[PDB]
Amino acid sequence: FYEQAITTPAMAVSHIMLESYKKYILVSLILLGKVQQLPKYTSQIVGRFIKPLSNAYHELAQVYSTNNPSELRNLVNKHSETFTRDNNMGLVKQCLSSLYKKNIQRLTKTFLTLSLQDMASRVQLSGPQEAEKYVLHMIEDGEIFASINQKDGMVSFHDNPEKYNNPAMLHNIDQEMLKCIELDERLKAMDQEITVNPQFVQKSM
Amino acid sequence: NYVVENPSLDLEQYAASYSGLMRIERLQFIADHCPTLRVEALKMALSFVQRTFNVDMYEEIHRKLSEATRELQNAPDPPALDTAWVEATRKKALLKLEKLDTDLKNYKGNSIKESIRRGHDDLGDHYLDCGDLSNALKCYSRARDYCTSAKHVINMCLNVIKVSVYLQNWSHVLSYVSKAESTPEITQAILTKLKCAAGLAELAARKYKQAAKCLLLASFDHCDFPELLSPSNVAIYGGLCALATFDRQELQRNVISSSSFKLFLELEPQVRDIIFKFYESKYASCLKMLDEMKDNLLLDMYLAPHVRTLYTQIRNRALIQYFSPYVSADMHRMAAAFNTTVAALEDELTQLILEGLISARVDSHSKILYARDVDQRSTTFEKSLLMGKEFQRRAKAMMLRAAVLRNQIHVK
């Protein structure tokens, strides 16, 4: 929704548009861990003017790209009043939590079995209990497929248990198929409505 | 950065192997970057700089030697430049140069292209001896105009290559190497000198893959090439770059097929063992020799910044090849395959996995490095579903764009 608001063609930049761009950066940092590049079907000077204006959120993204929660937290404290006129400061905290989650996810792609003590040291946590809680919460949300061994203080990461042999994946593919067929029917209807126009017929005749 | 402390350099051989302004530059950098040996390096430098009537760099070197001698007069608690040299050097340098200039200008009134080119080359040679870089270039850049034969073009290219190395205009070196090679129909081994100059220029230009390829083609029949680079450093330059860029089969073919780098490896047995140990998966002995090669060759001219990057690449490549034929590779054994500690290797391995090209997973429980062999189909299906989701999102975006354009919705 934020991306669609960004791509609105406008001859004048407005505050509502400006805030939509700022919220777009925050969600991009949370979800994808980086600012998604604006498309090329684009917009008007909205793009030209906002980027210099929303410099602080780009600065937050830059430090987010450096991947340092300690440095990121220091920047947030430096720019506390800079993000305060947002009616929301939790998004910045959600960005920090997403960075911690992203670091944990990156550990799965690089480790098969990692201890809680080493995990906390790598992502700079206060202790193994916080890492144990963080892994448990992410598994609850369905973001991580791993297992913890409290007897040896180890966390064993695992790949996707989906071998794509269950009927659930087939049903999901069929649902996407139905969505795509409805998409194509709507596209054909719009193309026919386009064909009804006077200008294309005049060019054809 | 550099300027580290380390002993055991042989100053006599390194100074005698090179000759010319290249030797002058080598003695200065060695003195400037190797303390506890700068005095003799500067003493030998000034003793050679006063030869061939240097003017400006002599003052810099004499001042540095005066400072160095003053430092020696306070630790175990400054030489005179003999300014009679200034009177003597200037008076001789002017008279011969003016005599040569008078001849060439008269020859310019005689209008002979080769004579003008040869005289300009002589003027450039004198200016380089006098310590006048740009002055030599203009003389050389006027000899380039009056060329008549292919050998004249080759000599013109060699002179510009020589000067632009001192000027650090390596772009002019590479341009003239290309001109000297591609033009005259690609016992007198002339292309070998051009390839040696190109490899040195590329290496100084932060290039390793092409520089090693050019250095490997250099035939040992060139032998004496002290105006640019000694054969001893050429072998080292080729070996380090080949080890960092050339893979195993790439290394084996190129070294053997060239048959001149085998002679080069005979000159430097240390790098020959390093490459051989690299082939035979003995990286423990390979890297310990490399660290021994580090200090002896980090006080090199065009190597010191690049060698650190080259050595870092060598360490990464050695680890990649070592783990390749291993399913359950014990991190203890991999750590034992070098003088590194278990924790240090684990950090190095983790960094390599983050960067890539090792395709492995670290099992810190038993400290065993397990290789990753992901199913192609599962990843294919996952990324195909992601692509379909992105395509649906972009289709929604395009439909919304069409809706807002058809209804003429825009901010006024």
Place this chain on the structure above:
Amino acid sequence: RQINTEYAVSLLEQLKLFYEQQLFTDIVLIVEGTEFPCHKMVLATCSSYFRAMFMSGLSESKQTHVHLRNVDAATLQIIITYAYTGNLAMNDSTVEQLYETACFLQVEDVLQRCREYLIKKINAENCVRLLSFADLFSCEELKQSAKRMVEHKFTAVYHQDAFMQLSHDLLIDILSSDNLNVEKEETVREAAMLWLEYNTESRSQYLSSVLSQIRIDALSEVTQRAWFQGLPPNDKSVVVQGLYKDMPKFFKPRLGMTKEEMMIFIEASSENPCSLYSSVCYSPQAEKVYKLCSPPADLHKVGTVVTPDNDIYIAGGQVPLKQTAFRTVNCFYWFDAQQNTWFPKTPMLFVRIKPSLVCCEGYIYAIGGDSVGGELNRRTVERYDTEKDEWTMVSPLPCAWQWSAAVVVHDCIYVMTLNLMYCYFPRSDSWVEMAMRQTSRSFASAAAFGDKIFYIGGLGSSVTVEIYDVNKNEWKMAANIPAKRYSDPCVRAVVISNSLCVFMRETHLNERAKYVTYQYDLELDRWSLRQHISERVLWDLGRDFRCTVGKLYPSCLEESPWKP
């Protein structure tokens, strides 16, 4: 190249010996009874007239005694010895006759040297004399360069006596030119009127032409019946002629009436990263930013001054020596208000860094500026003479100061430092102790408005203002400039539109620099918003940039192409 110099000197000095010791003389010059025994060789090397005098085949070819007339003995002697020893001693008086004999004898080398002397000697009091001299003898380069300096200077003075004795063609070129610098088109009108009325009816035939070059806004109003009073009696070919004559010749405003009060900036942030700094200007009326020529050889760390005659000068500065590399040079330059270029002038005696250039009584005063000497008199205060084009030392200031500013009030030099102030009395060349400030502030600028000194800012800077009165001799506080908190304003004091305005650029946290100027109410002690400089026209300038008050022509200058 050249040929053997060691024999070049030997032959030269030996010819001089053969000249002072008169031995090998075959031709002698007879000038007003003065004997000039010399050779045909040496006269040939310099002059191109003696080559048509000896190797021509006339009677003088065999005659050994020639009576050279219409020449001067002193001019001939210096020319002859210059051909014999090359030492062309050129003073400030005999250059006029030196050119006359050089043109008469067609001596190319001395002609170029004296032309190079006259191209440097062109100034206010001899602009008319040199132009008439440049009109008499074809010296187009001097004639054009004079004409440019002539055009501005006549408009300023228009009272020199040699202006009356000028040729008709020269006056027509001067008056019809579009380079005149006049605040009004009426001063050139009366200048022509007084020139026409200077002489008898010999100006009547030229009157039909001089009015044909002046605009018609004054060819129907007053100064038409005045000529009728001065008309020759019963002349009916002029009164009726001018009655029906002023139809054509396309009334158009001149260029001199296009000077506006503008803020000249130096050492601004260069738009293109290839260059270090640049020079720009702000237009308080046109609301645009016109570009200026770069400082001579990118002269950084310099000072600016604008005389009451509206002239810009540059003194001091350092040039990057041929990574940090900078060498200080004492070169001096003058800015051309029309050609958009810096004309070099007589350099100073000592090099300076950030010198305070102040004009007073026509003299340019450079106080301090981090001199190279460093001796007990580590100030090196020295004035510049604008009529003799030379520098003269003045009384040294009592206390050595650094990062100081100076202004001129009541025909006196007022230099300000961290807390002390000393006034220089030019008539007696002495320094007198002044009032002491209660606040320790430096790195600030002051503007002289009326009979008061306004020290604005000081230390970034702040909004502290201390007003000093010359008649009262006391430092008093007025108010503080209302600016945004948690910022670092860059204050610049300047006088514009007969009011004390401030050029203050402020920068907020994580924000770009904002440009805004305020008008300080003298009686109300309050800074009022006079105008807000939009960022769409003016970009960042930097920190070490200077500002000064002056007038420039938007027509000669060009708008700087740069994105908002």
